[PDB]
Amino acid sequence: SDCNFISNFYSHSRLHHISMWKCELTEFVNTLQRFPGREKLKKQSCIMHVDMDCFFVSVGIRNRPDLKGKPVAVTSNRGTGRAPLRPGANPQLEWQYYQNKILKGIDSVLSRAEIASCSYEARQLGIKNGMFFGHAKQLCPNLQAVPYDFHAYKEVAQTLYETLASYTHNIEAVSCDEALVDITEILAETKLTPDEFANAVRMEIKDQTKCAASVGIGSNILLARMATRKAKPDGQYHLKPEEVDDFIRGQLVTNLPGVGHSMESKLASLGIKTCGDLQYMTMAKLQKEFGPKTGQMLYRFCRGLDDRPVRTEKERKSVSAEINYGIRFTQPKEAEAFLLSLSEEIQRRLEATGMKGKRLTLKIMVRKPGAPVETAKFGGHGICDNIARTVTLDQATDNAKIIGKAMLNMFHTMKLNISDMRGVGIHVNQLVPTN
DNA sequence: ATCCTCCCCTAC
DNA sequence: TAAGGTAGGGGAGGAT
Numbered sequence A: 001s002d003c004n005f006i007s008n009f010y011s012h013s014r015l016h017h018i019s020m021w022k023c024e025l026t027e028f029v030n031t032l033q034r035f036p037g038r039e040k041l042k043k044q045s046c047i048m049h050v051d052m053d054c055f056f057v058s059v060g061i062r063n064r065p066d067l068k069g070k071p072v073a074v075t076s077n078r079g080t081g082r083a084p085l086r087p088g089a090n091p092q093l094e095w096q097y098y099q100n101k102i103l104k105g106i107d108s109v110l111s112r113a114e115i116a117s118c119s120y121e122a123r124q125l126g127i128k129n130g131m132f133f134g135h136a137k138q139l140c141p142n143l144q145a146v147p148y149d150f151h152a153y154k155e156v157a158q159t160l161y162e163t164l165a166s167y168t169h170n171i172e173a174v175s176c177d178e179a180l181v182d183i184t185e186i187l188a189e190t191k192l193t194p195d196e197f198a199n200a201v202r203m204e205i206k207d208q209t210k211c212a213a214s215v216g217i218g219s220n221i222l223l224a225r226m227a228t229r230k231a232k233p234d235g236q237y238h239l240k241p242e243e244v245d246d247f248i249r250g251q252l253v254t255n256l257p258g259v260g261h262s263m264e265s266k267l268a269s270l271g272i273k274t275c276g277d278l279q280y281m282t283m284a285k286l287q288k289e290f291g292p293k294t295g296q297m298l299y300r301f302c303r304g305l306d307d308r309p310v311r312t313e314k315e316r317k318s319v320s321a322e323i324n325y326g327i328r329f330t331q332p333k334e335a336e337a338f339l340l341s342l343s344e345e346i347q348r349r350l351e352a353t354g355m356k357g358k359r360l361t362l363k364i365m366v367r368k369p370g371a372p373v374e375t376a377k378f379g380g381h382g383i384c385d386n387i388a389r390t391v392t393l394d395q396a397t398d399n400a401k402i403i404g405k406a407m408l409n410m411f412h413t414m415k416l417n418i419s420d421m422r423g424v425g426i427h428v429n430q431l432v433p434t435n
Numbered sequence B: 001a002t003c004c005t006c007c008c009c010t011a012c
Numbered sequence C: 001t002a003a004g005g006t007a008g009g010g011g012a013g014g015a016t
């Protein structure tokens, strides 16, 4: 049953989990705006970024001292690095497409399970988060596989924020294992050097989780995030003002928060690889080429300038639910049955968050023409494109029968081969809170 | 100029 | 096998 299929997918999805945890930690921090750790150590803006090292791995091997110091990966694959042969799939074509259009603008039995997190040992060999386990185990035959433990990560994630909250409420939740903290007040009250405090928080986090955090310190958010890169693993790095200009010039532009593979490829065609190359670009040229806001962001960031305060309050703008894995329909009756289920799921989330929406958007992934019907990854969406529809209701609703019905009307206007469908997503906008 | 609407992109 | 989600920023381009 599609009802059990949905529940079962979300049950096993790490990406669904990290998103929920982020949502929860964000709400916890918001709450704090409506300190045992400071007094227990009471015995020019300053920003600290706290980021746990190889978070799933570290938690996974907490109580497994045989795996410390080894190449380890958190993945679904039991450990062989093999999967059943998939004849008619074309891993080569999908990988080329991934390197060409996506990373820019025996193979047949290898595991295509993703590595969620890998140890630093494993990294010293090119294994990175998001690599297929089959391939990783080719780069490093001694890669150790470790199962997910979602309960344990949620517990460490919470312990992490509780700990930071014990020093200050001036926190921004970046993710489940990562927060920004403004420590200007603490340093003034305790009279401690930024480094002394950073060490203290690290010692305490390790004490309470058996997991290591790296800390980056700087006079703004951008600079604190970048210092963390240099701090990892198990360390800290204070990027002082006198070092900013020389540190920044050598950084690959891709390291700037907000520059991914698409922006990188567009900059490389401008002849720009490092932040230093970028500094030579005018504000007017960056805005013309990239738009006003992105243009300005690039100009400022490549200089180490950033004036965003720590955002302690975040308001929810949308609720959604997508599954782009294990979607295979043959009949329009099956697809419409599934749309009505995801509609009950979207009702639960709107309720759980106490919202109703006016604007409803259906997004379908469809197999791309020329792309093989048999996916390289078991259950994968493979190479696809997106069809999207949007409607707007007269009243904000949270009723699945109305949402379901809206999804069926939207789905009918699509020109679609059911057997090419590879993913479905419902997105709710223009929210209003209940009561 | 500001405001819509339909997307692409990015972070984790 | 394997579980490729989720929210928000913002550009293009068009109507107001």
Ligand SMILES: Nc1ccn([C@H]2C[C@H](O)[C@@H](COP(=O)(O)OP(=O)(O)OP(=O)(O)O)O2)c(=O)n1
Pocket (backbone or CB within 6 Å): A014, A015, A018, A051, A052, A053, A054, A055, A056, A057, A115, A116, A117, A118, A129, A130, A177, A178, A232, B012
């Ligand atoms: N491709 C990815 C990236 C991240 N996450 C999960 C696994 C990570 O353990 C956790 C935190 O991600 P980070 O980006 O902080 O990376 P790590 O903590 O694993 O390593 P690092 O030490 O580089 O921060 O989120 C995931 O499921 N899949």
Ligand SMILES: [Mg+2]
Pocket (backbone or CB within 6 Å): A051, A052, A053, A054, A055, A177, A178
């Ligand atoms: Mg981390």
Ligand SMILES: [Mg+2]
Pocket (backbone or CB within 6 Å): A074, A075, A076, A077, A113, A114, A115, A116
């Ligand atoms: Mg996996």
Ligand SMILES: [Mg+2]
Pocket (backbone or CB within 6 Å): A051, A175, A176, A177, A178, B012
């Ligand atoms: Mg992280």
Ligand SMILES: [Mg+2]
Pocket (backbone or CB within 6 Å): A253, A254, A255, A256, A257, A258, A259, A260
């Ligand atoms: Mg970047």
